[PDB]
Design a protein around this ligand. Structure first.
Ligand SMILES: CCCCCCCCCCCCCCCC(=O)OC[C@H](COP(=O)(O)O)OC(=O)CCCCCCCCCCCCCCC
Ligand SMILES: CCCCCCCCCCCCCCCC(=O)OC[C@H](COP(=O)(O)O)OC(=O)CCCCCCCCCCCCCCC
Ligand SMILES: O=C(NO)c1ccccc1
Ligand SMILES: O=C(NO)c1ccccc1
Ligand SMILES: [Fe+3]
Ligand SMILES: [Fe+3]
Ligand SMILES: [Mg+2]
Ligand SMILES: [Mg+2]
Ligand SMILES: [Mg+2]
Lengths: 250, 253
């Protein structure tokens, strides 16, 4: 512990000091950086900042041990206690909710490819303007957050709308850093999932949309090729898609 | 420039991510680190943390452009407004202040080695228990903080006490990290100085004591060999005391 903490923290501090020496970071830049770091804490952006820049690396080590299908970062906007939904499964939406309807057909199987029943899935997403409930408190509580279960056939059908890409807020320290550094502040459109069943290893993941704006260029670096969804446009239009998740036994 | 700040911050982030990958840093470690970072801000320890681990590197690049004598980090405990001391210059001390008496003979010269008169020097130090005024609010305000001036000969004599070495306090996040990484939290004993005169570049520096513990393992990595003082023990009326001499140089603007 003492040995390991020293090793990891020492290497990180050393690497930062090597860049300071290499780039000849100035006192003026140090003072600005001090003010900025203070502002991250004052604006409660530690989880946002860290999950943008570092969670993907943490998650990549964890993923080496994956026993089911492909995983991704959680990100900072999970909220516990999202509503248990009812058939026909519909994400919490307003009567006049903007956006293109999406019907998502899900399957959850084990390592043999056998369906898993009574799997719990938490899903959350941004609305068509790229806003999350609770995070934006002008949205109705629990908008676009819910829990559903699989069938005896390991299946569910879920109606929602296609989320918009998400921008790290420009009026915060993290957004200020991204602007200052000349880096785009966008995540591609995505659906978050936490998938659990007693006796199985849980799966935290994200799904994106093939050729979506920002999918090759995620600020959070959290996309993986296995996690791209293809959409069929259906006339009546709305979009339809499907995905199979895999859980590994404990 | 966006180019420059992106280059610097990009390199830092990549470097931290390489360490995460090589050391297999876990989600549990990431969450503990998140809570730790939050605590740094909640306890107002950003200047302390950064000044412990990073200011030496910043100061070392700054120092390559020095026009005068050797410089060092400022650290986070300077407080403006210290009293102008009166002759014979004596640092603000309590009537029963403990510790060994130190007589410090200073000189300030220009880059030709000629004396500089009316140089203003701000000096601060810890007491014989390793505590700073304001920082530890139970000490009298401006204890061991004072301003003096060089005379016509560029000289001054200052009476004080030998400061103790300092531990970064474990009761805060910076000290908690040092403790958790198995690293000593000590700075060797030192006198801090900000030295200024119109038409000259200011000098920030620290002076340490040759014989002192921690000069080879400063938690802050701010010791430089030009800044080590030698002490002479003087036995004379009544009690032994210590004397030391230093010559500072300022370079013109
Ligand atoms: C863990 C703490 C490490 C902090 C190290 C301090 C030195 C940082 C040097 C970066 C200088 C960038 C130029 C800023 C000048 C401006 O100009 C003012 O402009 C701004 O909007 C604020 C600049 C953002 C500063 C970012 C600081 C990042 C901290 C280190 C990166 C974290 C990963 C490690
Ligand atoms: C600002 C940018 C900083 C980047 C943050 C990267 C997050 C990964 C850091 C990994 C640290 C491993 C700590 C091991 C541990 O579990 O240690 C956790 C112990 C238990 O709790 C502690 O009190 C120690 C907190 C460690 C905080 C280190 C963060 C410094 C980041 C480098 C500068
Ligand atoms: O939506 C996200 N999922 O990762 C996200 C949002 C902000 C910062 C990091 C991640
Ligand atoms: O030198 C110091 N005296 O204030 C100092 C430097 C870095 C961190 C803590 C203290
Ligand atoms: Fe998200
Ligand atoms: Fe000090
Ligand atoms: Mg796992
Ligand atoms: Mg200079
Ligand atoms: Mg030089």
């Amino acid at each position: 512990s003492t040995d390991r903490t020293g090793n990891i923290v020492g290497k990180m501090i050393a690497a930062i000091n090597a860049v300071i020496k290499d780039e000849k970071v100035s006192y003026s830049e140090y003072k600005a950086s001090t003010g900025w770091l203070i502002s991250v804490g004052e604006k409660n952006e530690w989880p946002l900042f860290l999950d943008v820049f570092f969670e993907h690396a943490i998650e990549s080590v964890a993923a080496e041990s994956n026993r089911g299908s492909q995983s991704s970062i959680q990100g900072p906007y999970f909220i516990p206690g999202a509503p248990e939904l009812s058939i026909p499964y519909t994400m919490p939406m307003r009567d006049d909710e903007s956006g293109d309807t999406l019907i998502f057909r899900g399957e959850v199987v084990d390592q043999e490819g056998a369906p898993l029943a009574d799997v719990l899935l938490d899903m959350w997403q941004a609305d068509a303007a790229g806003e999350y409930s609770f995070i934006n408190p002008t949205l109705p509580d629990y908008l676009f957050r819910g829990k559903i279960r699989t069938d005896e056939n390991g299946r569910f059908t879920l109606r929602t709308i296609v989320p918009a890409p998400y921008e790290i807020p420009k009026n915060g320290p993290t957004g200020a850093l991204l602007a200052a550094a000349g880096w785009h502040a966008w995540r591609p459109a995505h659906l978050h999932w936490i998938i659990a069943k007693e006796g199985y290893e849980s799966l935290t993941t994200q799904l994106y949309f093939e050729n979506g704006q920002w999918t090759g260029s995620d600020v959070a670096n959290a996309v993986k090729p296995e996690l791209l969804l293809s959409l069929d446009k259906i006339e009546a239009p709305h979009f339809e898609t499907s995905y199979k998740f895999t859980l590994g036994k404990v």
